[model samples]
Target chain A: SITENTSWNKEFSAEAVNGVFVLCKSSSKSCATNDLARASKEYLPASTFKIPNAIIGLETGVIKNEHQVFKWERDLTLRGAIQVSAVPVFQQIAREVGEVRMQKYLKKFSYGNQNISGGIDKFWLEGQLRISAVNQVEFLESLYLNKLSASKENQLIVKEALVTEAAPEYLVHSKTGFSGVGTESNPGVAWWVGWVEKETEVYFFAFNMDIDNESKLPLRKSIPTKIMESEGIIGG
Target chain B: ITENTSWNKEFSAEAVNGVFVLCKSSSKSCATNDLARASKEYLPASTFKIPNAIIGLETGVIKNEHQVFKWDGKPRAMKQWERDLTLRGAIQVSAVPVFQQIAREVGEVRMQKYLKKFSYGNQNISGGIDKFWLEGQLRISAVNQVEFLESLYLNKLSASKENQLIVKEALVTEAAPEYLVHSKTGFSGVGTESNPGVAWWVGWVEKETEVYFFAFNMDIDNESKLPLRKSIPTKIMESEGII
Candidate 1:
């Protein structure tokens, strides 16, 4: 109820791009686009679904953090795998976590459109495991505050799996996701989700844009990074 | 399609060596007063801001037209930039800091990519991310400017029609009851005591059904002589009735 209904209409409309951004500072929210409706509009999670998938996998004991075996073990350490977004490895992690267990955790987490009906390995990519940008911020916020049902240690490990910048004044942790344009879908969404921790304050944010061009993929990270910079949440 | 040398007198009167390439859309004929220099290249200077703005928007480096560029409150070469500027204002004032941030944001990889895509001046942005169009080695001919400007005028720059039109719109320099002018100017003072800086005035004139695309540039020894960058070209266009 304390959320601010701020609009980034000026920012999005000026660039002639269509997208939504949702940011929550500990207690409430703000946005960059006029599409507050889109803020809750659910779409496939793409690779960003990896966040909870990692958490659930660890919680379920399907894969231990350090001493696990992967098909390409050297290149597939949890951090290494996530840094490059190794789909097959995560797909295996999902398969090992299995359909029954994955659903159990998603329900516990109250993940969006949480059907997970298509395939355990591919549901988040091309199936019914859709989540909205707003939902993403909600989930990340829970994780940031260690408010999730998962073990606090598991949550912290999941945070370490994310790419981060430990600048002197603050630490920024974030992840990127893209489904690439789908078969029945001409425009797949690009996503950036994560939080910033500065001294006593923390900020959570999520953004998604249509993958209109492959060249624009860089923007998934660049745009969110810029928005944060503009808001003075991050340094120039 | 007779080659035109008559425009040279205007440049001589201004006491500068320059070239002008004027192309008529209806005739598909391009006329240049100095064929050799028209094809020769020089630093694009601020003139690159046109395409830079387009690529910035297309690449999402620029959030939107109304996005306000916050000033860092540092000293600047020109006092005009002592305060925050709107995106459109930054373009009009030719704010180097804004565009420099844009270029750096575009990064070396993406900058190199679009330069190749725009086919800009040998596609050379190698020296530094922000300095290439100025003191760096990037160079474009007057002929290249006219051609790129025409391609942009026709909305054929391989960028979105909306984006191209946005850049085209931002370039409006003059508007009247009968015609409109879209243009940009540049001054890259690569001048030493013996060498002169390259000055440019590039854009198009649209009157009724006709559109004339042009690029004019000169070598100048004095910054006070900057007005001639446009005046020399304006005189030539008037003499040829291209305006």
Candidate 2:
């Protein structure tokens, strides 16, 4: 229904990728995606689960505000842990957040599948929990609107904590999730998901692609960036 | 997003292998058990009848739903196709020869024109005019399949609104007070013990304010698994609190 497929699809064809990208506008409630099929399809949340994992942690009071230091082997603040993509620290948070609480928050947030059948530490990574690009955008939309089943205060605490870029024109809060080039049996998925705040409106996006090798992972963010620029959501 | 395991479990319990995709029109979000395969392409089988019927009507080759194609008394694949049938009956029974005749009458040029106009599949009908969607080269993934159905549901296809509605009405498989289901079933198997063909159930559901478009497809290892085409998605839809 929307024309975002043209350049974005051409870009995918031009770049030769097996991927899907979805961009949504809060004001319009309109979306453009290269592949609605793939966009609607679900994949392992991979590291992107950290976005909610962190939010659950804060809401449950397992980890207080962003300033609290997490001790796994050494100490790292919530900000430092996410910056380094520290798995062990997040794993500790998930373990402390526990399975019951995690599942409760996921259902509250309406996260993918809500299957924590896998070990609490790796469910989003290697567990049964799955999320589609469209679902990713929905989750981000909730967080952006502060409408998630969590406290608005804790939501903002993690929201700004994940912000990677800030300027008068725009602000980007995003994360990367890679299941890695798992195994021949498991394969893998790469993702770059988040939103941008420009003036009064927010543009949310979620991208996922199959990764045959580690080198293809960067396309997750760069590709969405180029599409965002192409759509004039942001400037190059 | 919702967990589809209970639905996925029913599929596994039946020894059926396939993917189900359900998307709410208002939300434009979908939940699925196997997103990868759901996005992968395969032969469309009889489900193409939805568009084929629309094109035939649009082309004037078949006047309307009431137009009849009398049986030629020649051998046909299915017994149900051996009798006289209307465009409505042909689609209901998934009559192959009737559609084959319609495809031949529409001819290659017009057929290609309509599919390209609609942006259906790869727009590659090269294999054979009548056989491509079944045994030939044309292929569409479950993702593209549902998107195509959604367009058809919203009267968004390139065809005229009148012809599209006629076909949409033909797709009515269920009608209840609260909801209406427009669906079609397709099996790609040619003869007995054929190749690993695909089975499909594609259509949409109408609820008070939300229309959920869906497409389900699975690997068909044998003829016995054909029932899963409709069974799994129905169970999944029911589990998620849909009719």
Candidate 3:
């Protein structure tokens, strides 16, 4: 509904990196930060955690391959699961990976110094899943150089995530996430963090409407599709 | 002069984080590839490479606290030189041992298969200049997401040659690249390949112009001071006058 009409134009922007775009933000409030607000350092990871969780699964043999389908009780495969960003898939992987092992990987991955317990409490529901706009940018930089655990394969998986039907033609392997509505006036938080590239690998970290209201997480396969299809770093 | 743009008669945008300022840019460029969008992967590191260098030296017995002052010219005290050393000196005196040790300690943290040896500065000069942020894993992913941007957006060593040099000059308040250029800049890069932090810690490099640069904000100082700290990220943004 907000996508149509010039009169309906809302606040929107993005940050272009070596060519890869990392952020795309819009607002109804007074956007005081500069066009180069340097990406906020504080935000929740939401389903965005799926990226790391899936990565750990792929690595520790929890899931066979990043793409090989895993049939869940309710129509779920790794790829399809990532598309849905099913918390269950990730929760399952976290359990399999175990609390100690999962937390080990978390520290190794430098998600933050905060501890990660294998228990659902720490791993999923309420662990420390924070990221600043600046840190998001850093993560994307690492993605581009093909640097990470089992980087060769991880790169492949990153490619898969970005290229999912969820992304339009050009916007390849990537993932998006949104938090549930919580105590705040608006929903708890909304997020879209992933990697995209043309000739190179580009990482993106977009978190939206964290203040209040709403459902679980906004499902915008269509919006992402349109945004990816839109021109100039997907300037909305 | 253009820094002072006229105020609009009336217009306002709002938000919790800040404002909703918009500028319609005019550019006629199309992407070259289609199947290449979206994103993922990053490197992850705890401390930048600087500490690694120090630890490396300690383990290798190549350097010690005493050595910090011994390596630099004129037998200067650590406090006197401000613990400064040549780019290689800092790393050699501090990081190399740790990196070599880690390379041996883990045998090889292969997150990503070794592809190409990337150059730090503009590939126009030097070898063994850059490593994929820090000394391990060698992969990419979102885990290192937040740290990566901090390394880039905050550190001065990562700044472009021109900008870094300008700040380098300002740090010492010198005109030509004389005394200020001679000072040491310490920085570090850390992260697994899946979550690498692109750190640029520079004191001095080969050619004085693009003298020295590396990654990570390690031991450089926690305070986010500029020139040595904010130069690179700030300069990169300032290039567009959007800052």
Candidate 4:
């Protein structure tokens, strides 16, 4: 695999740090470093899984548009829910999306382990669904290249909803996630998975780490920020 | 320039949440990640004791290697440290109170001067002579430790060779049939019960052909993470066939 040949792992040396996977299709270069083989080792996708959830919600009509407001314990537009990572809002959408359709959509997307055994609404959050960092890069690449099974309109809206950072030279669309929060019994899993669309090429990257507590949360974004700057995907 | 070379990340990742290892042979050298992180400053903790001992010997504050640091009759956290101690004894037990007294005798002016001569960390002794390295203003990165130790092994640190040798002797913590391991451990945290903010193990291995210098440092969030600072580097050296 691309990971076998890349020397990128030298950049990350944290115990909980899983090295990053970068696929610069613009340059046709794919690299993995740190624990290269870990790129394929699946773990909870956390909030990053929300990307596909948004797509699935849009495609299934459970979310009619970016402005679709859902009244849960609180009222949140689908776009606002994604911006804030409201788990309950998505859980409600998952209920509306229903089991049979949710399973089918996840299968079609080929997400992680595709196991929702923990119940429809709780699967991605508390269930057994998992995805590797490499798979995250692959999934985001497909979306950026307009290759996902979802409709063009829905994918565009989902992508628009995830604009985390924007500037004249670059735009970053990403999501951050934490699994097993509030406890140290299991190593907390934190992730930042997304792609940067630049002037000429799109840069897709995924970073994940097994953390001991909330203190390590900043690392999820910080490591990727360094790599992004060094790669010239975004201005330093 | 060898920043891109890859090493065993498994050992590093396991030992501490963050780890940077530097290995220098007589002929070549390589590091695990960004050398910048190595040069990044951090409180030296007890590792500074190694240099402090050398300064103590040179300045005449410590009469000789066997000179005793008579306990000041003050209550200390560790009961074993309440009595008089020689230079070697103080290091072996990592008696903080003993080192504090030594620092006080060396005085802030001379301590700052020696730290500057060694170019240790930021050379900021503003943390005060006694508590500066114990989460005080001074800091040294893993790379700086390797650089400082390498200079010492080469007798380049501007100290009398005899005094340097005496400091090195005190740091010898382990030995095998083939190699003698000279090392020191340091821990700095907000308090005893809290996870150590920093854990460090820095030293060199004396092999038959060449001396290898190494420094390992990691962030600690829990007590269980302390052992990796020593075990990880030891494991790395073993894998490299150094020990």
Compute each candidate's TM-score over C-alphas.
0.51, 0.49, 0.38, 0.48
**Clashing residue pairs in candidate 1, if any?**
A8-A32, A14-B64, A15-B64
What C-alpha RMSD does candidate 1 show over the true interface residues after superposing them? 23.9
Which candidate number would show the highest TM-score if scored against the true structure? 1
The iRMS of the candidates, in order, is 23.9, 26.3, 24.0, 31.0
lDDT (tens digit, per residue) of candidate 3 on B1-243: 011121111111210010011111111111111112101322223222332333233344333221332232334323323343432333333333334434343222221111112112111211122344434334322112222322322232232322222222212211121111212233334334353233232222112111222122211222343233335422322343323
The global C-alpha lDDT for each of the candidates, from Candidate 1 onward, is 0.76, 0.78, 0.36, 0.72
The pairs that clash in candidate 4 are A9-A33, A9-A34, A15-B13, A15-B17, B42-B139, B42-B140
Instruction: Identify the candidate with maximal lDDT.
Output: 2
Candidate 4: tens digits of C-alpha lDDT, residues A2-121: 555344454466434544555444422565444566777888877787788889988888887644666664566554567675878888778899989888987888788888778888
What TM-score does the first chain of candidate 3 have?
Answer: 0.67
True contacts kept of each: 0.00, 0.00, 0.00, 0.00
**Alpha-carbon deviation at B93 in model 2, angstroms:** 0.1
CAPRI tier of model 3? incorrect
Q: What is candidate 2's lDDT per residue for B119-198, written digit by digit as tens? A: 78877787788898888888887778788887876668998765776676566665443355778889888344445788
Scanning candidate 2 chain B in windows of ten residues, the lowest lDDT window is B171-180
